[PDB]
Curated annotation (Swiss-Prot), chains A, B:
One of its GO terms (molecular function) is toxic substance binding. The keyword Phosphoprotein applies. It comes from Homo sapiens (Human). It catalyses: an epoxide + H2O = an ethanediol; (9S,10S)-10-hydroxy-9-(phosphooxy)octadecanoate + H2O = (9S,10S)-9,10-dihydroxyoctadecanoate + phosphate; 12-phosphooxy-(9Z)-octadecenoate + H2O = 12-hydroxy-(9Z)-octadecenoate + phosphate; 12-phosphooxy-(9E)-octadecenoate + H2O = 12-hydroxy-(9E)-octadecenoate + phosphate. This is Bifunctional epoxide hydrolase 2. The active site is at 334 (nucleophile), 465 (proton donor), 523 (proton acceptor). Phosphate binds at residues 122-123. Residues 258-530 form the AB hydrolase-1 domain.
Length: 546, 546
């Protein structure tokens, strides 16, 4: 009975096999067959390559040794090496060409999700090349998805030596019969076979995966498209900045590159961006996912005025000041999307680019009070219910698990009408006490939101709605302005509150506005359609925001 | 009696005055005198420039209006504008050319250090240009040094309108007679004068500063070179990463750009880098100043083995993994300098560049036990005193303020002989109970170290020394390697423990090694010689580490 899966790196988790370049180089250079693959394994156990693979020497110390082996092999072969020959040039190109074998990673991910312990066992080197980062980046990406990464150059042992297999079994805490071992080199497979492990010789990925599903009894081939990588809260870097004596802002941070500041809506969390964080960091950005003022680990002062847009925007600028950031790209959803348009209008020098999910940019109407504006739309009637301090807090704080389960649902799973909350006298009046679990969330994900809202409740979050007159007067100062910095509006077909048609006039105030649209997508855009949100954001970031 | 100083931005805190470019452009283009300076102020109060300065319109909306004013002014002047004329091109260049007026900032810094409230009052705009970052960067740098920044485009008021001066006085909470106001425009000075404020018309900086010292009674001109900007712990972004179930690492983070990971020595803190953090961020780097394992807000497990170099280095790699960083440049001092060389030797793919202050790279001697090695040097005898668990902890924890005051001293202030700690039987035996305060530190800075060490004490920090045999065996694995990644060795003349001559053989293992040397510098390099450390590090970072 299997409970562990071990994968090789070269030719298994990463393709084309870096090793395959010696044969391709021989053919491209019309050199005798096997000359380069031979100079590579010269001396076997006490040869240069073994010492490299055991960590005795670095890759840059190995290059001159490989060239000496190429000369010696060529002499015996009675052939001359070409004039402009470079082992460095050949290896630099092979390494940079090698990419993650996506379906092999998907299978390893599926096995782990099913309770398998997974590991990478690889014969690798200590890379000190000026171009070492490309490889570091590949390793960092791959490794996060596995329980263990065992590298020959770190353990001082090499495949096929038996000691490395005994080491592998010890780190897995598994008997050989509980382990599938996948390798593209038959000689490196054999000691795992001799010990009694299930082994798979990997040539083409499809056959290898066919052998893997037959052996595990788990479907790995022709499987549905998996969800993007999520965040385990305890594995994230958590950041804290005091913006003023009583106010601190918490954020989760991942990656390197241009700063991307993610701003959630109501009643949410930094965790609402869980599917975006790993993807945006992988795309070459420094992600800062906020707990907005009033939420999670950020400060939640009780006063209404602490939540007017002007104060919220000023603190976000202070946040950038204290972290030492001259700019960030601001991406918001819902109330976060509203803050994001106002960041662009009032602080354009600090906003690299601006993007909103669902929330359109609507200017202030100088000839109509915000109350008179809510008069027009039946959609926004629940916002009047949010006005009286204490009322909505009580209903939303009454049962947290009920609150989040009732709210966080896909377009076809709705248990809340947000209509005549005025007639009804509550958000959950003719709503179930034990709502079913939406297909968008796990019970675990609901309990995270439940745990976050236990600290401060709903006062701070609901106060974002209690600044109508203040926000209107402040917004009226920007009536002569235009948003001329790079901007993205992402509409959601099935958001029945923030409908796509509400964004129809945006081009009048944002002429160069770029757009995205998600079909069959409800209000909770990030978790409803994560794959498409990621595709839209990454494409726009790489084109419009450095 | 003065207690507040107010400075203008253009022509006062930043030079050359962006305004001065209209006259320079006129002369360079042989256009009628004042034509451009005239089109700039066309319409006065309801003209385009006032609306821009009040925040009614953005800089990009203003450019076309300025061009229209240039045409109208040219028509009246009976002159034709040149063929390739561009207001954008002219203003882009003027803004990028304008730099901080360093001696004016120094004077504002000195006044604030003396208890003055300082402010910037400026007529500025909402910059939405594709090149807005250069200006954002200048504002972010300047603003941090002042109590208030008042911008016309944010307050919707403009100099010379009287309302802005009343607003200034209200934000300062000062009566006009308590305020010096410095401006380069006479018309903008007058309302402050009418109200009774001390005013200074600024033409050349020297005369302006002469007027300022006469008026404040504080020397601001010909003053000594000030210390680099330090860190106020409560104004920093604090980060936390769990590297394993029982271990979390704390760090302070500032800036954007390539990641620079700062690693302190014994018995120190992230705060030991206080003079480096603002300078390195200002230089275009993302600074991550660690609390090393066993220190400050980082975890301090009790076990000795938790502090062997192998485990310490593995956790630093995990730290990079969890933050999503493929690399960082590693800069270490003392024990941090030792970790930094080993990071380069074992994880070169993760180390962008490596730099050490004081600590040389010394390879393991395979023919000598670490005890036998301490036998040779009388210098390292105190390390034998550190071996027995509980002994040094008691003496160092006995009186914290005494511990740090006795240790943290310049080369000429030494109260500790670290000799015959074996003969003496303690680190502080013939040492004063109330050591004087070293010129390197304030009482406040000592109390920060005192407060940090109250959490975990000296067990974790002293455990870094209790892994001699383990570190030696691990280091012996790297005996065939060379450090071939960019490296910097910074020696300190007066460090009597980590002497410069101890670094003499480094080139044998690091051939491309770069060097720096600080004269009249003791062991506490960062606070002993901050200005020079910063100059050496920034120069090396800009040349060798992206
Ligand atoms: C007058 S412009 C405006 C419109 C809506 C608004 O509030 C929201 C952004 C809309 C939906 N609501 C969140 C509910 C959980 C769905 C917050 C705030 C301002
Ligand atoms: C065998 S190579 C070696 C040498 C020294 C060493 O320890 C230090 C880095 C030297 C000074 N000591 C800090 C004292 C407060 C001054 C730590 C560790 C290893």
């Amino acid at each position: 009975t299997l409970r562990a899966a071990v994968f090789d790196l070269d030719g298994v988790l990463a393709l084309p096999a870096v090793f395959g370049v010696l044969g391709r180089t021989e053919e491209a250079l019309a050199l005798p067959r096997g000359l380069l693959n031979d100079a590579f394994q010269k001396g076997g156990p006490e040869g240069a390559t073994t010492r490299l693979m055991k960590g005795e020497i670095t890759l840059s110390q190995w290059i001159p040794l490989m060239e000496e082996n190429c000369r010696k092999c060529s002499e015996t072969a009675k052939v001359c090496l070409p004039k402009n020959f470079s082992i460095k040039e050949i290896f630099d190109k092979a390494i940079s060409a090698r990419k993650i074998n996506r379906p092999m990673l998907q299978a390893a991910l599926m096995l782990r999700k099913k309770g398998f312990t997974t590991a990478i066992l690889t014969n690798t080197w200590l890379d000190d090349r000026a171009e070492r980062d490309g490889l570091a980046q590949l390793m960092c990406e791959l490794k996060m998805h596995f329980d263990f990464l065992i590298e020959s150059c770190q353990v001082g042992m090499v495949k096929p030596e038996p000691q490395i297999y005994k080491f592998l079994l010890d780190t897995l805490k598994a008997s050989p019969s509980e382990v599938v071992f996948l390798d593209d080199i038959g000689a490196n497979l054999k000691p795992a076979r001799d010990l009694g492990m299930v082994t798979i010789l990997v040539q083409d990925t499809d056959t290898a995966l066919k052998e893997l599903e037959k052996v595990t009894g788990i479907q790995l081939l022709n499987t549905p498209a998996p969800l993007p990588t999520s965040c385990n809260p305890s594995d994230m870097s958590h950041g804290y900045v005091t913006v003023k004596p009583r106010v601190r802002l918490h954020f989760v941070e991942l990656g390197s590159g241009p700063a991307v500041c993610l701003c959630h809506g109501f009643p949410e969390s930094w965790y609402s961006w869980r599917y975006q964080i790993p993807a945006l960091a992988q795309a070459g950005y420094r992600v800062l996912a906020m707990d907005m003022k009033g939420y999670g680990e950020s400060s939640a002062p009780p006063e209404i005025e602490e939540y007017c847009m002007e104060v919220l925007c000023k603190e976000m600028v202070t946040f950038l000041d204290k972290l030492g950031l001259s700019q960030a790209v601001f991406i918001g959803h819902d109330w976060g999307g509203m803050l994001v348009w106002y960041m662009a209008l009032f602080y354009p020098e600090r906003v690299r680019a601006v993007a909103s999910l669902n929330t359109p940019f609507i200017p202030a109407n100088p000839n109509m009070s915000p109350l008179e504006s809510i008069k027009a739309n039946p959609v926004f009637d629940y916002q009047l219910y949010f006005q009286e301090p204490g009322v909505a807090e009580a209903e939303l704080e009454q049962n947290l698990s009920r609150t989040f389960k009732s709210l966080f649902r896909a377009s076809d799973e709705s248990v809340l009408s947000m209509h005549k909350v005025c007639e009804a006298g509550g958000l959950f009046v003719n709503s179930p006490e034990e709502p079913s679990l939406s297909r968008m969330v796990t019970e675990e994900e609901i309990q995270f939101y439940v745990q976050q809202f236990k600290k401060s409740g709903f006062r701070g979050p609901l106060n974002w709605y209690r600044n109508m007159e203040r926000n209107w007067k402040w917004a009226c100062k920007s009536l002569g302005r235009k948003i001329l910095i790079p901007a993205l509006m992402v509409t959601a077909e099935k958001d029945f509150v923030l409908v796509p048609q509400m964004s129809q006039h945006m081009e009048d105030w944002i002429p160069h506005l770029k757009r995205g649209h998600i079909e069959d997508c409800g209000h909770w855009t990030q978790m409803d359609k994560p794959t498409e949100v990621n595709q839209i954001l990454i494409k726009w970031l790489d084109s419009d925001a450095r």
